[PDB]
């Protein structure tokens, strides 16, 4: 992949691999989320930000990292094994709040848009996990890599007891940790989907997922995935620590019949 | 990737992705095993065998599939994020016993061999799971895609109670299933490694893994990963069904200090 001509977005092509697809012989939404992260990491390296943490100079001095606050993905068509998908990504300033990253997915052959995503990322001190606002010094470091006029690819309630569906006692394995020994964010998408009934997964495709991230999760921890139907099929989701512990994630999904 | 000039082996290049690497910023052995499977699947498609099951014409008529009996991987150097690895693969007849698939991994830049693998695959009826010998009709269908003179890339005891180390209650999630809703074989490598102490993983790299596959495993099942030190560091491994149930896998690993 590469930066585009104007230097303000990044494109990469991926050939869908055999082990990346599910029963319908199309890429899983976890594969799609991994590809979104990969093209984002390559974009960060292409402008001089990357060691596992994409950071600006002032972020590194202040022990700040970007953490996901919200992820929103819409997929029109999942690509097949051997298909070529092209993903374009870019970022925009959200003032003091944080930083937006957007993506557009295309079928490389037809040029049709097959998916879109947007995310909100916020500053966090990597040691204390306390959220911070974006200073002028940090914003000024990355603004020169962003379109400055709008370019858009486009509350979640708390699940009430009792949950309709659950998958409890979910534990990460080493494959779920990133190069910084943090639980990979895509893991959270997988954990949400684990509590969706097999009958729904067999008969429907995921069209939209929205996840809020409240509090990151850890290697030694145990997570419960809770789901209730709110309806297409529509669900409300809550990830919380084992033992009726703290909320990690809440989300919604929208599913279309096959 | 593509078949080579003579049509008897297949090469593919992979650019190591951010999410494919572990703490040492090099590809995990699970990433390497996924890449071995991918280049093998692309080789099978390139000669007309592939629907999730690579099968010959007579295999499809008889409801036979190839299943892994043994996997043996040696890694000299794990590639970094952004590195290009080229994998060459080929197969050879093992007479009536089964079919061998071999791989060689190179660093595309230096041309140095960075790893090697060999595997034994056997015929199994997909419905009954009973092992079968390779008939002349099946062997004759695939022999024309194999070197016929030797081309080589190059017993495990049963772990005794009590195990030195364990990870119990391991359950697959949907991401661990392949396009045929079988547990992906690479999952078995991940499950073996889960019972290796974190201190060993932090201070050592995996140099050799050998796995025997006894009995495939299922979606609804629970697996215990058992490990004892036999020594570099050397381990003996046993995967068995929960409740002191049937053996799934046995294996060995050899680890080098970082
Ligand atoms: C802000 C920015 C502009 C242009 C190129 C790269 C960046 C850095 O983006 C960060 C890198 C990251 C990506 C790895 C998903 C994680 C947070 C972030 C917004 O997306
Ligand atoms: C036997 C053969 C010769 C040339 C090209 C392909 C094949 C089929 O190989 C099979 C495909 C497979 C691969 C997907 C790992 C699984 C079993 C097998 C030996 O490796």
Domain-by-domain residue ranges, chain A? 2-143, 165-257
The angle at the Cα of A60, spanning A54 to A63, to the nearest 5 degrees, equals 105
Q: Is A99 in the pocket of ligand 1 (CB under 6 A)?
A: yes
Structure tokens belonging to residue B120: 């034994």
Helix (H, G, I), strand (E, B) or coil at A174: helix
Which of B173, B199, B202 to mutate: most A Cβ within 10 Å?
B173
CATH class of A2-143: alpha beta
CATH superfamily for A165-257 is Hotdog Thioesterase (3.10.129.10)
**Do A146 and A134 form a contact (C-beta atoms < 8 A)?**
no
* Inter-chain Cβ pairs, chain A and chain B, closer than 8 A: 79
Residues of chain B neighbouring A184 (CB-CB closer than 8 A) = 19
For residue A16, the surrounding DSSP H or E stretch is none
**CA–CA separation, A170 vs A242, rounded Å?**
9
**Do A63 and A131 form a contact (C-beta atoms < 8 A)?**
no
Instruction: Collect all residues with Cβ–Cβ distance below 8 Å to A198 and sequence separation of at least 6.
Output: none
The angle at the Cα of A59, spanning A58 to A60, to the nearest 5 degrees, equals 90
Which residues of A are identified as catalytic? 180, 182, 217
Q: Which of B29, B38, B25, B28 is nearest to B81 (CA)?
A: B25
DSSP string, B109-154: TT--EEEEEEEEEEEEETTT--EEPPPHHHHHHHHTTS-SS-----
Give, using CA atoms, the residue closest to atom 6 of ligand 1.
A44
Q: How far is CA B153 from CA A78, B85, B111, B131, in A?
A: 37, 17, 16, 26
Structure tokens belonging to residue B165: 């180390």
Residues of A with CB under 8 A from a CB of B: 17-19, 21-23, 25, 28, 30, 34, 37-38, 41-42, 45, 52, 81-82, 169-170, 173-175, 177-181, 184, 186, 190-191, 193-194, 201
Residue of B nearest to A40 (CA): B18
Q: Is A8 in the pocket of ligand 1 (CB under 6 A)?
A: no
Query: What's the distance, Cα to Cα, between the start and end of chain B in Å?
Result: 32
CB contact under 8 A, B41 and A18: yes
Handedness of CA B148, B151, B153, B155 (dihedral sign): positive
The reply to whether B165-257 shares the fold of B2-143 is yes
Structure tokens belonging to residue A199: 């009958």
The angle at the Cα of B37, spanning B33 to B41, to the nearest 5 degrees, equals 170
Q: Which of A214, A213, A218, A223 is nearest to A244 (CA)?
A: A223
**CA–CA separation, A190 vs A177, rounded Å?**
13
Structure tokens belonging to residue A13: 């092509």
For residue B180, the surrounding DSSP H or E stretch is none
Structure tokens belonging to residue B99: 């079919």
The angle at the Cα of B220, spanning B214 to B222, to the nearest 5 degrees, equals 60
Q: Is A98 in the pocket of ligand 1 (CB under 6 A)?
A: no
**CA–CA separation, A18 vs A82, rounded Å?**
8
**CA–CA separation, B163 vs A153, rounded Å?**
53
- What method did the depositors use to determine the structure? X-ray
**CA–CA separation, A175 vs A152, rounded Å?**
33
Residues B25-37: b if buried by 16+ CB within 10 A, e if exposed: bbbbbbbbbbbbb
What is the phi/psi pair of residue A201, to 5°? -60, -35
Helix (H, G, I), strand (E, B) or coil at B20: helix
**CA–CA separation, B71 vs B112, rounded Å?**
23
Strand-strand pairing, B64-75 and B204-213: antiparallel
DSSP string, B210-226: EEEE-S---TT--EEEE
Cis geometry, peptide bond prior to residue A162 (ω within 30 degrees of 0): yes
CA dihedral A209, A212, A215, A219 (to 10 degrees): 10
What is the phi/psi pair of residue A63, to 5°? 60, 40
**CA–CA separation, B229 vs B235, rounded Å?**
4
């Amino acid at each position: 992949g590469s930066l585009t001509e104007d230097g303000l977005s990044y494109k990469e092509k991926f050939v869908v691999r055999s082990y990346e697809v599910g029963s319908n012989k199309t890429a899983t939404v976890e594969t799609i989320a991994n590809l979104l992260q990969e093209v984002g990491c390559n974009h960060a390296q292409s402008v001089g930000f990357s060691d596992g943490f994409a950071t600006t100079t002032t972020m590194r001095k202040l022990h700040l990292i970007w953490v996901t606050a919200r992820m929103h993905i819409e997929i029109y068509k999942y690509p097949a094994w051997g298909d070529v998908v092209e993903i374009e990504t870019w970022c925009q300033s959200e003032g003091r709040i944080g930083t937006r990253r957007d993506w557009i997915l295309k079928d490389s052959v037809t040029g049709e848009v097959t998916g879109r995503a947007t995310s909100k990322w916020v500053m966090m001190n990597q040691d204390t996990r306390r959220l911070q606002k974006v200073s002028d010094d940090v914003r000024d470091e990355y603004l020169v890599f962003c379109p400055q006029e709008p370019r858009l690819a486009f509350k979640i309630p708390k699940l009430e007891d009792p949950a309709q569906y659950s998958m409890i006692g979910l534990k990460p394995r080493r494959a779920d940790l990133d190069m910084n020994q943090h639980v990979n964010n895509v893991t959270y998408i997988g954990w949400v989907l684990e509590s969706i009934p097999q009958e729904i997964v067999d008969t429907h495709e995921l069209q939209v997922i929205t996840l809020d991230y409240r509090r990151e999760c850890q290697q030694d921890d145990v997570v419960d995935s809770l789901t209730t139907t709110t309806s297409d099929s529509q669900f409300l989701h809550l990830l919380r620590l084992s033992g009726d512990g703290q909320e990690i994630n809440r989300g919604t999904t929208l599913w279309r019949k096959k």
